[model samples]
Target: MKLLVVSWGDFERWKETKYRFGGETSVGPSTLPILQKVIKPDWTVIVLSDTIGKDFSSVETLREDVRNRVMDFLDRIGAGREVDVIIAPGIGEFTHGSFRGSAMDAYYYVLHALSEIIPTKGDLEVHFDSTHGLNYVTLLTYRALKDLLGIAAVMNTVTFYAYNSDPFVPKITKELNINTIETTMVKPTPLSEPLPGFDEYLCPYSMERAEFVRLKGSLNTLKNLRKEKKKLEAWIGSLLFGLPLLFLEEFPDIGRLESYIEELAETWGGAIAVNAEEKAVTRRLAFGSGFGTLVKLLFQARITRGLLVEEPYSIEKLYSVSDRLFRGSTLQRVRVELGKIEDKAIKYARKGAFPRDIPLRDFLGFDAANREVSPRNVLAHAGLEANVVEVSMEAWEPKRPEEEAGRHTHLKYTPVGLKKVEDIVSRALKESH
Candidate 1:
């Protein structure tokens, strides 16, 4: 299937003009006639904003008009082309802040529309025309089409085209003859500049695209590993955002993650061919550090699960598993030491005594005057004394006039307390072998 995706801008009062391309002249409101003459695609999708009309009531009328114009042009040339019009939200009416909302909606709209039109199994070629609408709209729509076609799992290729109308626009009269409107082929690249408010929301997509372009010639295994890294980051993010380790629906396969990390590290190490390329070395180091952080977080989640989820949890078993999985890695050492500290605290709690050691006190995560109030006891009794745990200060906002100052409270695994533990563990890992 040969598909042509073109953007149609506001042409409510458009005048027909002559456009010349490759020694051929055609008249139309835009470049659709010239494009049809050149590409002759099997199907054409005209994407336009919903704000083409003067008001909301007339938007559909405008869409029909644009559709008719293209269909009429095709009929005049006796070209058997299927035509469809897709109306996406306009930038000013349905979007704000760098067009993030509308761009996303537009991408999905185009993706869904094209998916339905594209055959389930066939050789596909996409031709994108970005000459008629806002640049971002065309860019995002093309990206959507590209991504959709990518996962089609068929032989496919996409070519982008833009009409250069700058030379003819200023000199246009009632009936402009555009002989210099060159239709140039463009190669789409990832956005080089920041997308302002949009980047934060669409970061994963942007990063994936950029990485795909960067690792263009790399092995498929390396690319797949990079994708795995991103997936792992999302899993770790869920854990950090207070998803209980015990109730986690799915956990990463640690063995696979470790293998990926090792392979990527080896590949990156050999990728550096010169010492003078400081930027490349720095990027590699940064990536290594990110992977290191992921490993540490993965271990922390696993250890937390061992403590809270595993029945008859044993500090010995925890130490053994940590050592077996990580060997002499800093994570193994930290987990073993933390396990020892927790075991000692539990023993002290059983004896109705609190450890006076600062590290032990911090590890126990409480400063109770009553010795019997301990996290170990609470956990052993199925969290009956869970109220003994410290509450984070940011967890509450006083609304009543009498409670304006807000009272201090406690909980066992308050976000702040958990974060403190993470900090201690991170510091230890960094300072140790």
Candidate 2:
């Protein structure tokens, strides 16, 4: 099936005018007639705005005028092509200076009209005339056809055409002449390959504006996650270890976090499958597939254990302490135990028996008020507390001056401290077995 789509704008001087294209002249009120004679498409769709003609008393009157003008010109020119006029919303109907929203609406209107006119089965060729209507109309029409016709089931080709009026700009008289207009066939750029791993999924065959917006949001989130995969995993491990006091008030549940990642992976996979089916040139979420793999890696036991192994000595020390206090407990179980201890200590502190638990005393290394701190409290009180066990900085210390030869200050954990802590945990775990 061969189809020609065009948008009609409100021109005061609607008359039979001569338009030259490829050394040939055809007469009509607009370029539609001339295009019909040249391209000879089986179906022609004329798109116009509903909010046209301020001079007309009602919108209906303006629509009627446009329909009559286009039909009359085609009839006079002896064109026998199937013609359908589409009435779309104008910018005036929407908030001022908002062309994107209006154009989106116009796209759907044109898409619905064209879908009915074109055959469901067979190869389709579309010639888009972006010469009339508002400036945005041309783009919206082109996009509509591209989205509608660019389906995998049917082989399709879409060609663009525009009436270039630049030649007559300098030679214009007091009154503009319609006869000076000429049609030019525009060669669109070739379609590029779809992003890696996204070739199978193209834009949806039929998508609503809401669905399109959501797909964009999901793709953005997945892209960001992929970029910050390491940082995200580190943050999750920090929450699990209970090293940061600020997170003690209301801790995040590891099970819940894992579930969220699972859902996110599923959503991203579904979106790519539906949205990247045909037009690879427009969809750029190439890293989308990699993110799903990342999500899988994140939840694996080895990945979580690797994060623990890579943590600073201070955090690892706390994990070690928890493991000693609660024998045979996995890292996940240690996290749960820490939560319970925090709760019990806080309950005792409120009644004036704070820091009473022996395990809490050993875990915190201090007799502080209300040892139990919620994850929310940890976030609120974001600072090192007395419970933090400071390690010596001797391994990283610079050579001191003669006067201060033996002096060394305490510091946070280092690679040396981390290595020592890992050795201790390995021995402990081995002894238990």
Candidate 3:
């Protein structure tokens, strides 16, 4: 099997706008290695990077260079030998600045550029990602690459949209590692900065947004414990008896959830906490609670319902118009882009790029929340507070034409929008708590 590792900049985001510099364009980080460790790396490897010789924002040029490189790489690598599989490693391009849809635009360029590279008769299978940069990137790729992946983006159990939630310096790609609930798509939300803080609407599903902070803190705490244990293990080994402590690689490990979960027990033992106060506290403080993610869910549902049922006006419709915030992919939403273009140009961009995703009913849900719904069950088992909160983020919102549309022109949503995070949280607590 031959794998083509496709990634943007190395882990550290470039300091410039157009492209990243200073090193060989490597796999974004250990993200690819982790995937290989989790999946398997039993293939010949070839690396093709567009982030080479340029800054991160140089979309058009970088894409052209990459496409050419990929075509050449493909031909050269398979010279005299037919390639079996091509795995484009997933990259977390956590773009920090907000240039309209600039961050998303990078995704569009990379995905579309790849679409151009793969030959029609090629035996190669192309996969972009739902693994990082928030699950959103994954869904965006899926919207375009579904037929190639075997399962529809909506139908795939794993494909998803994500918000880049890493905090600290390079705010775009996020710091914390990928947290999963099985697949890369519907996993935990990244807790990075989205300027006014991280927005969950950037991610897929409302699950991550509901328990956003707690999850990060818990995961980080575990990570810290491991680091602390590494340091302490040295001291304990001096006594010689504590050398066995070194065997327990992970330190003072009390995880929110883990393998200790009973096999016969029939329930989740972690990712859920009792004291509702902790849940409340996390919501108040965590950077990626995604009040926006919650907001997007209502809109996603509205979209799912609108397209499925055809009712133009609904909470989802309001959210959909703000498509930049809701459904995201690499295409940059050509139809709703900033400058006006001829219908012919619009037709070509849409056709040339083959943008847009065919949302599946499963990708969305009008069905009432189900206990069997792992997200809900996970939250429910995790304890109260945010449990209901997550449900709200994923659930249908109060159906009011005006409120859904928001009374204001600038600050608006069916239920007031991101700015109204306070009201949304308060009302949820008031009604559910």
Candidate 4:
């Protein structure tokens, strides 16, 4: 079986014995050589560093020296091998000294490249290795591979190798053919306990303050004798107050409540409950289909399409509004995205995408018109259409008195809205190109 290795770069060490430009010395470690010699995969793709060692601030220059070292190392060591290797440059980038989201987009390039070699089957063993750069990038790569190959393929056929600490030992001799090397396996350090399932999911449902207030005001519009409206109010109120800082003390991995809410609204097929605590608002993110491949789609480039609700609040300005960090624009975006993905995934199941399975309940705990619930079990077991992305947005004016008077517009990008955008964009492309 073929093995594909996606690795991070540190190949300057290969120049320890070699010199460049008459007197320049390029020296380093064993990261690249060990990867080339010891791992011995059927294929290799190296992610190059998008910076020069000279300037770490306000500048991003490709380390041509490092890239050259990799080429030279391959020439000397990989002469007669049948294994194919590709040098993927610019997969890692730094913007204003902070790791850019473009680095995470490396998952897109890697998957696209992998498909050309293996096509649609998890018929080969996949090995992922990394030791440098943003740890977030590494995680994205893992998630993409897991999605490309199913959970079963990832668990059974793939192996992840990480060198958290430096593994190179000092050499005592200048011998030509150095082969005697000792490798040690360090035990994993105790970190935190295992998080509950859906731990990666963000907590608390978040939205604009206007939305929170309007939804709460709907409770005032309710009659005291109405039971369903009261139930809805309880859910909305708890979601607004309880989501922020709720699980942060215990589960620090979750960045914000919006993340969790979006995940729940998009994937789960269940009911949510809330509590009015003296300390903080508490909520239960309803579940169904158990967060299958849908959550995985969010990290993918172009997979999370936006539904533009209103240009009233610039996304940047909206982000800084409050500590809650909720954006209605995002909520509308995901709703449209999730709905489209469900539809496409369902239709594709009849084709070769996934095996047939019964439908599951959606976020509301039961199937409704254009519900997000589907057979995620089957989707997760199959490969998704690579790079398929589409989004819809339009004026979603609230019928509530407060919002309607305020001229507020929500981006409720339903199937109709998305289709409109597609039509406009498609025509625009044809007109321009």
Which 10 consecutive residues of model 2 have the lowest summed lDDT?
274-283
Q: In model 4, which range of ten residues has the least summed lDDT?
A: 381-390
What's the best-to-worst order under TM-score?
A: 1, 2, 4, 3
Tens digits of per-residue lDDT, candidate 1, 1-433, equal 6677777665444555666666676666677767777777788888876444332223344446556765665565444566887776444433211111223545544554555575544456666766566776777676666555433421223333444442335345434333332233323221111111211211222234656345433534345545454334333432322222211222456666556445544443333222222211111211322333333433333333332333232334333433322223433433644344444444444454432213323445546555444433332322213332232222233344123211221123344334433333223223432
lDDT of 3 at 327: 31
Lowest summed lDDT window (length 10), candidate 1: 190-199
Off by over 4 Å in 2: 11-17, 53-66, 73-81, 93-103, 152-433
Tens digits of per-residue lDDT, candidate 3, 1-433, equal 2123223233233332111112212223333433433323234222332223132233343335445544454443222122232222233232321111123433333333333333322123233323333344444444434322221122123232222212334546434444332323432111111112222212222235556445443443234333342232222221111111111221122222221111101111122122222111001121122222222222222222222222222223323332321233311332222112122223323333211221111212235454222322212221111112111111223344223222111111122111132232223333432
Candidate 4 — what's its lDDT? 0.31
Candidate 1 vs. true structure, TM-score: 0.36
Please report the TM-score between candidate 3 and the true structure.
0.22
* Root-mean-square deviation of candidate 3: 25.6
Better of 1 and 4 by TM-score: 1
In angstroms, how far off is 343's CA in candidate 4? 32
Clashing pairs in 1: 389-410, 389-411, 389-412, 390-410, 390-411, 391-410, 391-411
Instruction: Note the Cα lDDT for every prediction shown.
Output: 0.43, 0.41, 0.27, 0.31
TM-scores, one per candidate: 0.36, 0.35, 0.22, 0.30
How many Å off is the CA of 66 in candidate 4?
7.4
Off by over 4 Å in 3: 1-50, 54-59, 79-156, 159-433
Error of 4 at 377 (Å): 17
Error at 59, model 3, angstroms: 6.3
* Residue 221 in candidate 4, Cα distance off native in Å: 42
